[PDB]
Each structure stands twice: as C-alpha cells, then as structure tokens.
Amino acid sequence: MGHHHHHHMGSAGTQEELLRWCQEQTAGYPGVHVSDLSSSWADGLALCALVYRLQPGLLEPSELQGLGALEATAWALKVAENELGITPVVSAQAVVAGSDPLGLIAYLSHFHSAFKSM
C-alpha cells in the first residue's frame, strides 16, 4: 500500500495518539496540564509526571515542578535514567525550548514501550 507519502493525515495522526497517551499517564496531579508538545515540558512537568508515576517513592516532581525548568529536565532525566535505565535522547535546553519535536516524541516512545511491556 501507500500512495506517495502524505495526502490527508500523517504527522498529526501520530501526535494525536502520543499526546493522548501522555495526558492519560500524566492524569492525576491536581495542577498539571498535558496538551502541548513543547511548553508542557518547559518546567519538566510532563517528564516528571511520568517518572513519578513509575517511581513515586524515588521521585520529586512537585520539587522540580517549580524549582526550575532546566533543573527539572536535567534532574528528572538523570534520575529517570538512574531509576529506570533510559538514556537521554535530547538535551535539556532543547527540551525546555521545545526545539526538538522528533526528539521529544522519540523519548515518549521509549517510556511508553517500557510501560506497555514492562
């Protein structure tokens, strides 16, 4: 199958399933909105929310939630890898700046595949 590449849906078609799964996993925190593939990860809320869900006894989202964006990403990314074992795919600066859509989505896939199977 396949016509050429794109015709109606393709890029957004994947983001929809990714954003939907992300919001569901980040659902529970009385003060966290997950509906953006950039700003949502600014303060590292989306990433922290996921990590905390996997290791609630080895995470501190609320701590890095306001302490800082760069610190939240670097801290969550470092601990996430230490607690889960997932090696970072993109730099904190890029994540906080949202200048890496391909990298942000790829990372989410790693976390999803880890929980999808476990």
From Swiss-Prot:
Record-annotated membrane-spanning stretches: none
Official protein name in the record: [F-actin]-monooxygenase MICAL1
Sequence ranges assigned to domain Calponin-homology (CH) in this UniProt record: 12-116
Family: Belongs to the Mical family.
Entry function: Monooxygenase that promotes depolymerization of F-actin by mediating oxidation of specific methionine residues on actin to form methionine-sulfoxide, resulting in actin filament disassembly and preventing repolymerization. In the absence of actin, it also functions as a NADPH oxidase producing H(2)O(2). Acts as a cytoskeletal regulator that connects NEDD9 to intermediate filaments. Also acts as a negative regulator of apoptosis via its interaction with STK38 and STK38L; acts by antagonizing STK38 and STK38L activation by MST1/STK4.
Part of the full-length chain shown: 506 to 614 of 1067
Gene name of the record: MICAL1
Domain text: The bivalent Mical/EHBP Rab binding (bMERB) domain, mediates binding to predominantly Rab8, Rab10, Rab13 and Rab15 (in their GTP-bound forms). The C-terminal coiled coil part contains the plexin-interacting region.
Domain of life of the organism encoding this protein: Eukaryota
Expressing tissues: Expressed in the thymus, lung, spleen, kidney, testis and hematopoietic cells.
Lineage, highest ranks first: Eukaryota, Metazoa, Chordata, Craniata, Vertebrata
UniProt subcellular location: Cytoplasm; Cytoplasm, Cytoskeleton; Endosome membrane; Midbody
Subunit structure: Interacts with STK38 and STK38L. Interacts with RAB1B, RAB8A, RAB10, RAB13, RAB15 and RAB35 (in their GTP-bound forms); binding to RAB1B is of low affinity compared to other Rab proteins; at least in case of RAB8A and RAB10 can bind 2 molecules of the Rab proteins simultaneously; ternary complex formation of RAB8A, RAB13 and MICAL1 is possible. Associates with the SH3 domain of NEDD9. Interacts with VIM and PLXNA3. Interacts with GRAF1/ARHGAP26, GRAF2/ARHGAP10, RAB8A, RAB8B and RAB10; may bind simultaneously to GRAFs and Rabs and connects GRAFs to Rabs. Does not interact with RAB1 and RAB11A.
